[PDB]
Amino acid sequence: DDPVRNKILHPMGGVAFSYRYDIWYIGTMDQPNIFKCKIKGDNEYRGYQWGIRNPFTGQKGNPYMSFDEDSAVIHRMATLGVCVLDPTRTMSLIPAILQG
Amino acid sequence: LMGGNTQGVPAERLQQGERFSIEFAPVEKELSRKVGDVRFTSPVSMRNEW
Amino acid sequence: FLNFPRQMLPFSKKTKQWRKDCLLWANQKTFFNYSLVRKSVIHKKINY
Amino acid sequence: AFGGWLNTQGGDFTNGVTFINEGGSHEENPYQGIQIGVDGAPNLVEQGEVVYDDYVFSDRMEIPDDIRKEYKLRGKTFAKAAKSAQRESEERPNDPLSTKGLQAAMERIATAQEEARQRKEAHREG
Amino acid sequence: MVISINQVRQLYVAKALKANTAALTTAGDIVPKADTAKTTLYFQSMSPAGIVASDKINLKHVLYAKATPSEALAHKLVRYSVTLDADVSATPVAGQNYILRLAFRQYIGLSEEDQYFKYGEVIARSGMTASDFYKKMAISLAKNLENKTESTPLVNIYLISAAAASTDVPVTSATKESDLTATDYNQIIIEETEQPWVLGMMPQAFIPFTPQFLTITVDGEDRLWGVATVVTPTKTVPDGHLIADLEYFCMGARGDIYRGMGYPNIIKTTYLVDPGAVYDVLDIHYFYTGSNESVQKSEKTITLVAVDDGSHTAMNALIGAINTASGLTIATL
Amino acid sequence: MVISINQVRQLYVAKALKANTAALTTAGDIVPKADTAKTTLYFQSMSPAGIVASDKINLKHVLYAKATPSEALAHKLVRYSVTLDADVSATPVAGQNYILRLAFRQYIGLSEEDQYFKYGEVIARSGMTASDFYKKMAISLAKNLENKTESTPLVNIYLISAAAASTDVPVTSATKESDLTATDYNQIIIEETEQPWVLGMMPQAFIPFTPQFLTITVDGEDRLWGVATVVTPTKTVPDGHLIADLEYFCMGARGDIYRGMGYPNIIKTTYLVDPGAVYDVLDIHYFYTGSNESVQKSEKTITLVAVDDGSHTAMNALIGAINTASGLTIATL
Amino acid sequence: LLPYDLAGNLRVLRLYWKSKRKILKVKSYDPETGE
Amino acid sequence: VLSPKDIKYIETMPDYIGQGADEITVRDGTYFFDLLPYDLAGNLRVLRLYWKSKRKILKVKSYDPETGE
């Protein structure tokens, strides 16, 4: 029912994503059907390049400078996916006004 | 011009022979970049014999 | 949080959520150390 | 607790002078003093007086000028004159010369205070 | 208001063109200054307390220099044509409650999770024509929305007759049944309203909505009542309140960063933009490179704003003055 | 600028005059209304957020009603014409040190116990004439006073050529003696200048001054070298900074007394006085006396301001609309 | 990041840190001697 | 000997750093981007200065009471 992402309204009020029926789990499967694939070891690289000051870590004075400007940028990145082993074990029912 | 001058420097102050001297090198507070430099000097030698 | 939660506290303000905010920081911002007298983990793993 | 002590490097170093504070006067205290010792059993000290070698420098008295020009005191009180003779030795309590400089100066204010006590007793009984 | 910047943004108001620095007499004047060797461009602008210049634009380091008309910054207040859906019934069904729901979405807070719901209501009766219906529901939609005691202006609601079909007759909380004397009403127009605006503290932001209908039974079936189609907007708010807020932010880059914080003790900056006029925008966006192994770009932009009089003469004179002094291909709009 | 009130004083800006209550469309309009029996008078004015009325002036209970023009509220800047004292020597004697001391008196701080003394110094030569004295004197006074690196201007220095005899020769710190090519000078005119002005926070005040002289030894007698008389003033400060400060104070009687204090959490009142225009002021003093035992008066006044351009076309229309509505005898200036 | 293993194990993160605590140094004259 | 103002300086300091040897990221999962008081590990510059000052003292000649030495 989240109206920030769901923007198409249904004719009967509310967002159009409210009228969608999802049976995620049909029976038991002896293994996880839906799971969140995450890489072993890929912690997100917290990475700062900075100049003479670093406002995040709070470091005054830098021995190894990336560049010469009063800046500090954060770069973080994550490799991530999901996997549904048996999509036939999962029955959905979508309103057509979401246009597939 | 740096010191708030909105009328200009006279033409008498930009003549040949006028010595110029370094004071300092200001930057902003925010997103500063590099300015300024450092000057040095060399010694010369003298001579006597026996 | 920004850093490790403030340690210069009285003992009564070290509540259940102050200790959990400390431990949640170790979950997130403790993977990359410029260790001064140790080698890298990728260097040691190659040695084994 | 800073009273005549040098609490540095994890250790507690004294020069011998005991700055007996935090109590109050004799008449304001329940006990009437800090009761530093029972060795006379009520050995009672107040907030202003200082002790060196079990000798009490009183804060109630004053420094007459006849024993200011001789014995060479610096403060306005005998307690404040013992609080100024220990200013060198309170930061160097292990010094051999300063512990000689402190013991020599404390005997002077001992003889300065004892002369004030006998000249007062001659004034009241006379 | 607060805007996003590409590392800086500084605004100058082009109230006049004087062609040299010796003719700068009143506040807000502009000369685009450059030399014969077209390598530096800067703007000696007359502030209310002296002559001030800009950062010196290296003309080999410009990225885009685009001037926008005043018609391109006008928010079009959207409308909705609320009618009777003829598939259910061409006439109002004589026993049903005819209710229409307005679902507002920015309320008093920005997120689309802050909402507000207002209603209009008409009991439909026997012999009530569709023109007697829209005369009865535009009043009931005005008594809830065009009221005097609401906190903020929400919508403007009109009626459209079938004879004229172009002019809108306004319906408010004071309009009676006898004032709207016409027998050919065919739609109800629900239009957005400009919200109140305060300089620097309350930005120009609007409240959207969606007219949603309720179900009224016909032959046993609970059929949705009406249809609402987004007709093209005919009223726009001017550019007067965006540029008045734009001088308020970008004056803190060239000047004091705080504006009133502690009021015996402030530096009162005098502003030059009238908030009651429309204005054109010109953005020269550039950067600053060095000569090293550390060379690349500290990106900047300079906004110049000239007054718009209908055919953009005060802006095109600035573009025609920058094009000769600097030699850039800024498109005369 | 905090002014004194007998009791409360309300200021209303008359930027335009109409004749009907339904004619008020712009911010600043006013109408003088009354009965047909001449028993009350009140002004309906157009605030920028609605129509406001004034208090009901009982036309039996008016004390005075006088209208003040713009030239009565213009501060005449005083001038001091310094000449060489004729009985001492009309020409500068050779080898003496001619020093002039300008004695300021409200330099900062209202009391005259806060003073300030600026100096000018000339040592004369054997070939220095009287016209060559004032050239070297005013080049030294503007060297001490009107330096650009100071905080505020204090006085203005002017030379006078006797060939023109009415056109000032302005001497600043950037002028040399090469610019002053006239060989016929008869006096130095020292004239005070306009101090800065920030409305509500800094009132319009001025620093007075009187030049004093040091003694010189002409014939073994230590006589003072000059005489300073006050000529009639020719430059006047306009009325704009006095009426904007008069609306800023009296917009706390109608409106809010908390001006700007807790800066995001305030109400701001919009001021309809442009401080760059001269104004004419109309003051209607009256009172309220109640029925039986409340016979003590509440002596209150209502101020109206209208901008004039040379001939007072707007205030004489504002006076003319009141006397046909109220029955007063307000003088048409 | 990952609470489980593929041998069905649990990721147990032990953290140890040196917090700061407020203590008071009290100087007490004993009643018997004076030390 | 540390004052509580001086503990507040010790408390507000670097204690975390970030990845290290617009940043181009290389090496896939192990992404690699391509007299000062802290050590970029959370340490403090304890500079300790030892020096020999000068002290004015007195050599005093006195006489033993019991024997004239």
mmCIF file of N, CA and C in Angstrom, chain G residues 14-34:
data_model
loop_
_atom_site.group_PDB
_atom_site.id
_atom_site.type_symbol
_atom_site.label_atom_id
_atom_site.label_comp_id
_atom_site.label_asym_id
_atom_site.label_seq_id
_atom_site.Cartn_x
_atom_site.Cartn_y
_atom_site.Cartn_z
ATOM 1 N N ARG G 14 32.009 -11.517 18.277
ATOM 2 C CA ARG G 14 32.405 -11.027 19.589
ATOM 3 C C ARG G 14 33.156 -9.715 19.412
ATOM 4 N N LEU G 15 32.696 -8.666 20.083
ATOM 5 C CA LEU G 15 33.370 -7.377 20.091
ATOM 6 C C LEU G 15 33.788 -7.057 21.514
ATOM 7 N N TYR G 16 35.016 -6.569 21.674
ATOM 8 C CA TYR G 16 35.542 -6.151 22.963
ATOM 9 C C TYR G 16 36.125 -4.759 22.807
ATOM 10 N N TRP G 17 35.740 -3.841 23.685
ATOM 11 C CA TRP G 17 36.247 -2.483 23.594
ATOM 12 C C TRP G 17 36.533 -1.936 24.982
ATOM 13 N N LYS G 18 37.365 -0.904 25.021
ATOM 14 C CA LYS G 18 37.782 -0.269 26.265
ATOM 15 C C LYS G 18 36.992 1.023 26.421
ATOM 16 N N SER G 19 35.885 0.960 27.147
ATOM 17 C CA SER G 19 35.124 2.168 27.403
ATOM 18 C C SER G 19 35.780 2.971 28.515
ATOM 19 N N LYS G 20 35.317 4.204 28.688
ATOM 20 C CA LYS G 20 35.789 5.079 29.751
ATOM 21 C C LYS G 20 34.770 5.096 30.877
ATOM 22 N N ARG G 21 35.249 5.049 32.115
ATOM 23 C CA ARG G 21 34.366 5.056 33.270
ATOM 24 C C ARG G 21 34.855 6.085 34.275
ATOM 25 N N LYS G 22 33.912 6.724 34.956
ATOM 26 C CA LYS G 22 34.238 7.800 35.881
ATOM 27 C C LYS G 22 34.481 7.233 37.268
ATOM 28 N N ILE G 23 35.675 7.458 37.802
ATOM 29 C CA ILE G 23 35.988 7.068 39.165
ATOM 30 C C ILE G 23 36.410 8.308 39.939
ATOM 31 N N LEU G 24 36.414 8.173 41.261
ATOM 32 C CA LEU G 24 36.702 9.266 42.179
ATOM 33 C C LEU G 24 37.883 8.874 43.050
ATOM 34 N N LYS G 25 38.896 9.730 43.114
ATOM 35 C CA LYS G 25 40.020 9.523 44.020
ATOM 36 C C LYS G 25 39.775 10.308 45.303
ATOM 37 N N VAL G 26 39.551 9.591 46.399
ATOM 38 C CA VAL G 26 39.206 10.176 47.689
ATOM 39 C C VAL G 26 40.410 10.079 48.614
ATOM 40 N N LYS G 27 40.713 11.171 49.312
ATOM 41 C CA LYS G 27 41.818 11.222 50.259
ATOM 42 C C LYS G 27 41.247 11.311 51.666
ATOM 43 N N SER G 28 41.407 10.245 52.441
ATOM 44 C CA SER G 28 40.735 10.103 53.725
ATOM 45 C C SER G 28 41.762 10.050 54.841
ATOM 46 N N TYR G 29 41.640 10.969 55.791
ATOM 47 C CA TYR G 29 42.447 10.942 57.002
ATOM 48 C C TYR G 29 41.913 9.869 57.939
ATOM 49 N N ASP G 30 42.737 8.875 58.254
ATOM 50 C CA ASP G 30 42.295 7.844 59.180
ATOM 51 C C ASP G 30 42.233 8.406 60.601
ATOM 52 N N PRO G 31 41.242 8.000 61.401
ATOM 53 C CA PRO G 31 41.090 8.589 62.741
ATOM 54 C C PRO G 31 42.151 8.166 63.740
ATOM 55 N N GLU G 32 42.852 7.055 63.516
ATOM 56 C CA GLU G 32 43.751 6.546 64.546
ATOM 57 C C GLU G 32 45.101 7.254 64.514
ATOM 58 N N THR G 33 45.694 7.401 63.331
ATOM 59 C CA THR G 33 47.071 7.867 63.219
ATOM 60 C C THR G 33 47.198 9.226 62.550
ATOM 61 N N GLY G 34 46.661 9.389 61.346
ATOM 62 C CA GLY G 34 46.834 10.624 60.606
ATOM 63 C C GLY G 34 47.330 10.376 59.199
#
